[PDB]
Amino acid sequence: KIERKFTTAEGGAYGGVGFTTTVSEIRNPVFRNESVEVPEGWSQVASDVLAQKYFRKAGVPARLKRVKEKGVPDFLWRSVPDEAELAKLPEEERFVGETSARQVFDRLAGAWAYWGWKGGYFSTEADARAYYDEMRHMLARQMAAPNSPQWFNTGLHWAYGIDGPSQGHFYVDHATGKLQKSDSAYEHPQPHACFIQSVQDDLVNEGGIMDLWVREARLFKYGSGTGTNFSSLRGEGEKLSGGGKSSGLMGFLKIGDRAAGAIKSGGTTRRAAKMVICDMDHPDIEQFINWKVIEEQKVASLVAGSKQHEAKLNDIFAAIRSFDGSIEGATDPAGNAGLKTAIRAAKKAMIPETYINRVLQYARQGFSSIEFPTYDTDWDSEAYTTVSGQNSNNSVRVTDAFLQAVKDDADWALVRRTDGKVAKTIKARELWDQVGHAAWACADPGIQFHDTVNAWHTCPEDGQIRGSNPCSEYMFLDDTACNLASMNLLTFFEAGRFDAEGYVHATRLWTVTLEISVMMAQFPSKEIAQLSYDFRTLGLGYANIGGLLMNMGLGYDSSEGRALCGALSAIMTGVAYATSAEMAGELGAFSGYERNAGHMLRVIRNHRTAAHGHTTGYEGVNVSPVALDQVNCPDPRLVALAKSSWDEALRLGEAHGYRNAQVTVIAPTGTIGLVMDCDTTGIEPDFALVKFKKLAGGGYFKIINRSVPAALETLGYASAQISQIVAYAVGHGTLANCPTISHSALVGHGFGAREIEKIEAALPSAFDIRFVFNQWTLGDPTFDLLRHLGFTRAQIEAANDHVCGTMTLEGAPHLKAEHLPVFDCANPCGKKGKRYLSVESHIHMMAAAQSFISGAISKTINMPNSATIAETLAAYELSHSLGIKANALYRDGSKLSQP
Amino acid sequence: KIERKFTTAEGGAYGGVGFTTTVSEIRNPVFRNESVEVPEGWSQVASDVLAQKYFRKAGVPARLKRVKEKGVPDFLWRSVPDEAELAKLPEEERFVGETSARQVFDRLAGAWAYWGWKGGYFSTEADARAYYDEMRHMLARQMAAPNSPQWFNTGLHWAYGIDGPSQGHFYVDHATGKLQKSDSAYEHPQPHACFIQSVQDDLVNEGGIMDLWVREARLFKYGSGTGTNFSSLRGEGEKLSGGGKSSGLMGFLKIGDRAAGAIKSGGTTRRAAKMVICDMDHPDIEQFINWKVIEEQKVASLVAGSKQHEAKLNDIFAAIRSFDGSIEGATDPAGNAGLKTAIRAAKKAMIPETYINRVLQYARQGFSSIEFPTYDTDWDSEAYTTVSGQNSNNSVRVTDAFLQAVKDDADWALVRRTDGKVAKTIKARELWDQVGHAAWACADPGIQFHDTVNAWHTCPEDGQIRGSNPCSEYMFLDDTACNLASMNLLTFFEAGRFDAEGYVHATRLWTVTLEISVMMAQFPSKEIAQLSYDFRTLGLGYANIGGLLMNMGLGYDSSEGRALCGALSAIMTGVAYATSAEMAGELGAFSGYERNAGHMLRVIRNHRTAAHGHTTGYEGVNVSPVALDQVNCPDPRLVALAKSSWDEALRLGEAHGYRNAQVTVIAPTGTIGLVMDCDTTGIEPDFALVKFKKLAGGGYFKIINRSVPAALETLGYASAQISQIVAYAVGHGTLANCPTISHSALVGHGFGAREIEKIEAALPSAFDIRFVFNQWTLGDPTFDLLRHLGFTRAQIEAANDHVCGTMTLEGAPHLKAEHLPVFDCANPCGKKGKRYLSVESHIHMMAAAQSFISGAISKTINMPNSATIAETLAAYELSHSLGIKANALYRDGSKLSQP
């Protein structure tokens, strides 16, 4: 079942990979572990996130002993502290924290193999030995990684003896199939990063509104995210059986929003991840669309008003203080003309008369001034915690019918939830307008295309897909969990070849492990435990496709680059489904499959019809996906492999079905992308060609984007000119080679024992005017303006581009113009660099990938500050053109916290 | 057991009480039932509250049939709809609503007697017949009434067949003693108005923070209030086992506060009643004390800032609009000097640069102005719903040690909840200062005296008394319910005699029924059901003691009036305890009594030591109560009865114990006082001597306070002079008898066919200047100022006092100066009336009553706007002087909503 392609049998643990140890610390202008062992190629920040957030910091026993279990192999036995050996050492060092990456690599794959074995997944013991070896190798060289909950939880009870009580958690016994209540907080890992949760139009019973906040709080405590479609909640003013009428959807959303703000996700600095989705026909949707817009207005008022009070109250207190006579007359606006002026100013600034009256009654008691805190517009201001809507991503579900109504300028009915009658009729175009402006003002609402989501839904018999997770990549039925892992697409690219069969080997074995994590997990709800057991969704993904594309010498907006993406998307998902189909053959499909086979192989078919590049022939899809482009793919192998693995994936599917109702999902990889040293996260392109790497010392050093020399290696450039181009962008750090301001030109003036001072005071490289401190030198200094006299300001900026670098490859020597788009990034590089990738470039590759992905693609498109509301809606409409399931926008410098 | 003192056996249903029917409607500048049958003496507003909020409005079967139960008496059988008879009538009128007061009187006492019988409370069937008859009679003539939940719930399933499903509710089977889950939403009444609820320092498990909001929501849905001491919640920054640290008490309080704001109590307009209490040694108490102070500042900023934005955004849009040229230059602050001025003004008014930038980007898209809602300071403004802390009464628990520390100027340690270590040390005096200022600025925090509460705690073995209900009258262990009912103290006063033995008969039989309501009730929690079964607390109270005092001719600040109060307080509680002791003899004490007997008879003893008027000899009390004043009581009978019934109450207590751990409590009677036509609510004095009675037509008519003629009857005044004094205060409504502006004086000028126009255009009586409309008359009218020429303005105001009344008895003819304090009210009467009752007058009678009350006394003292912070703290300190358990202050015109 499992074979070996990356590891040996003899050095199989870590076949020839080096190790080093670094210090990792964080302190404010607080944490430090002086020995952090990692693979040698690991960056400083990769070692940082590993120690700071993945290492089990306390309670690790210093000496362990295996626990032999009858029927499970030798190397896979659970381990418990050996107090006979710990009793030797002092109690200070009996229990410590993790210190090395292989500790975590071992506990992760050990737990995976241990559970996978007792689940009978591997048919041999050599396969388990191989799977164990192969897994830790892929982790060690940053080839793939599970979502963070796996990193800090799974293997804790298997490798060490760590245990503890647990309440309200459940699992399905893989042997019996019976639902059970978990009694260990660790024996069953909690490996799921997020959950889609349902809510019923009910206040106080299970599955209801108030109980949802308990369910969301349970998730937030351990660090998981949650998402929910709230549209079943009856609108404001809708009749309730008992007598009165409901307060409405917005009122309860504000409860859970305020609850989310108070629970630190995992006890950490981290915010709680929350997704709030409402359907467009909901009666209160107009309140929902403009929720963050209004609250933002309240923030702005909160700070304009608070500072107004502070200023004019100080003026009133000054007028009372500066009064000749008693306090009784000082505080009378009649007798005190100056106080009357200060109140006149206060009233005209809309300071309420009521508060003007109380500062007066303050002063007669004998008070000099009152504490009146004012607020700022910065992120940390209490004003943001005062208003609502700040603790959730808000998105609306739009159906194709609504988008038909805006193009027809038709009417749109908002229908009551209680009786199905029409509460309101509004032009669809003004509703679409509200969405566009709200997303132009603040980030939200995001948008998800209901009909596109459900056209690819594998199990509609058990309900519609109504919601998603906080980053909108996992889309399945309510009360199911996201089970995620992503691969570094760049680790498969040696010389100029993409290790294709090592890639298919990668997805196959990670499809296996993600399956084991469904088997081994406990869950925060009885229904979530039962459902994930019954459907076994997986979310395998990838990152560093922006970095890979650049490394192989292809641009992000190139048509060949998008065809490549759609290829590797098709291959990973195809093999994953085929792998799960093999799992269903040797173990049985998920219990919800038999009633859903008709639909699941329909979407499987549609995937295959797209790998063959067909224009038409799609069964029951609303927007035909963008087919696998055969012609521009920069390798005929991968297209032929995408065709073959999808062909078989259907064949085994007809044979046995599938062990899993979903397989693939593209996450943001916001933090696991850091520990894998991914140059680009998720599906994103790169953002710059000169970066600032943190290194072992703790400082940040300016470096060339490592993909730029590699790109200049895989095209036709020699090593002489690659360092020429690199020197152009990053700079030379010195004036020894600078043409315009040379040393010789410098000593033209009284310079001599002042050059080495300049020459590496120059490598901080902050676009230099470093000619500052020397007094003695043949000189009074006014302010900024002794820019040194003799050279043109063009000579200075030419010298600046020389030492400090242009930070772009535009204007670089020896670079052919046809090879310029290959270095385009999401933002202009350097200061008068002007090239960047289009909004449409982002969208069109999401499309190219979405056609071969079970769920959706995490994405928030950054748009220029100059963007208009029409362009905003155009982006949404353009996404719907190409079978996109969800999208989200943020315009540069939209929000109030932005300086 | 039960004997008859108010009703006959033959006309026992309603022995000679008349009935009438009124219309009751409410419409905005919406509800109307044209036939509302009530007892004839019932005021319009009493009939209003009965129909509008107590009548079961729908689902009442038009024809009922009894259901014969073996072993229960004839007249007490449950009733169910008789569909054999309803099938006759059309389905429009098969099920209707209640229409008459006797319907509710019958279902209340019928359910009381039905459950009381099957509980074996009455030893005869004649006693049940008597109890049934006596109960409905006391209700019919407004003698006593249970709290509102009893009015609209109990008897619904007994008298009519109304039923329905119910979740999450529990009761203890009175036969088995086993806890059971209620399956009927109506068979067991939900008669409890409020609950004290516990909370554990835990997020997501039962009894924890998030689960509390579910428990509070359950209460709010049916209309009950809740209170909780939150101090076990660990302070902000306190370490949590897992790793991080807690967000703190204030964060979670804001969750439940926001949750309370969204749940309409009972589905109605009514707000949810919520009590939030924190201990003074809590680390976050400073945030708690100033919670409403800061949020109020945010409201003021919210509206000053919002209106600022509206004004200056309009100015910016005006400057863009009034620009000669393109929109591209119109929106450039450089090219557009006028726009630069408007931004200059906006920036100096602290309008954030970020929002100034977005209105600019608005305008270039082609927008004339943006919706920027501004807020008001009035009660209904969204600003109040934006900020936190608005949905709860907040009070702090202070111990005697803290009050020792302010008088010693000692230090005060705020101790962590997790480890008991000191988090902070602060001078007690500045903490006391913060409390005083916060309560001087806004109403909160109220204050409860922990040690005074627990010195009178009957069952300390089962924990301390930590909290209370929203109006602070019910004080017992956590997770118990308030079971309340109050008596109209005035209904017992015929001629000049107080029907004393009818009063003792009243409390005895209402102590019985409140006991039955503990027996028959279901509860919102398993622990609340078990505990209230195990301790069976009762909260019997009274109202209309202010009206009674005035009727018997005694002033509120008189020492004789306070001695009277302390008398009737002692008698009611003494008989109630003695009654419950008799119940324990024939039925057994509550299960929690045997372990607590040592303490319960200690507080029982202390009560007796006070009825005998002892200065000293109190066991384990922190502040000795104010003893029953023997000398100034205006009746030696009641003092002798207070002594005797308390003497026996202890004797039966030693004999059998008590069926109930608490008996008496003085509630606000805010609405049941209306249906009982109580002139004064709870313990409050009256507020005016001229009132405005709503009458059958729906209009409001100016009337003399009915207690003023009665007071002038029970002292030595004749019927000639009582109408003289009445005419002085209410007015004459006519100028026929007016000395200063007579008819003869009027016709002195050209008046003739203009007098009858004046003479009852004069009885609206709005302090008249009714000389308005006539043109033709021997006359141009400038504005206000044609105050009619000929008379002095003193002649006019003399005529005004004649027709419109002085609305006070100050300056009234024939009234002896010694009899003036008898008419003092909580507010000055009329416009240059100046007498009113002291803050100390309120406090000293709460004291006189508190010594003979199991719980506390609902109270928020209204203080003059001119009050100082020192006076505020002085009132709190003065309350602690006399054994007050709780107090609350509100200064006239403190809050922002006050015009």
Ligand SMILES: Nc1ncnc2c1ncn2[C@H]1C[C@H](O)[C@@H](COP(=O)(O)OP(=O)(O)OP(=O)(O)O)O1
């Ligand atoms: N007191 C209340 N104030 C405001 N909204 C309320 C209140 N009670 C219920 N709601 C709202 C919340 C949801 O929108 C919906 C839930 O009502 P709830 O009674 O809990 O559900 P239900 O399924 O029993 O139906 P129904 O409301 O018809 O009795 O009504």
Ligand SMILES: Nc1ncnc2c1ncn2[C@H]1C[C@H](O)[C@@H](COP(=O)(O)OP(=O)(O)OP(=O)(O)O)O1
């Ligand atoms: N993620 C969180 N963010 C903020 N406060 C939290 C968080 N988790 C818990 N708290 C606060 C809420 C209460 O003050 C207290 C409850 O912690 P919780 O873990 O639920 O209780 P516990 O009794 O299990 O103890 P401990 O916190 O020591 O594990 O800590």
Ligand SMILES: [Mg+2]
């Ligand atoms: Mg309801």
Ligand SMILES: [Mg+2]
């Ligand atoms: Mg904890």
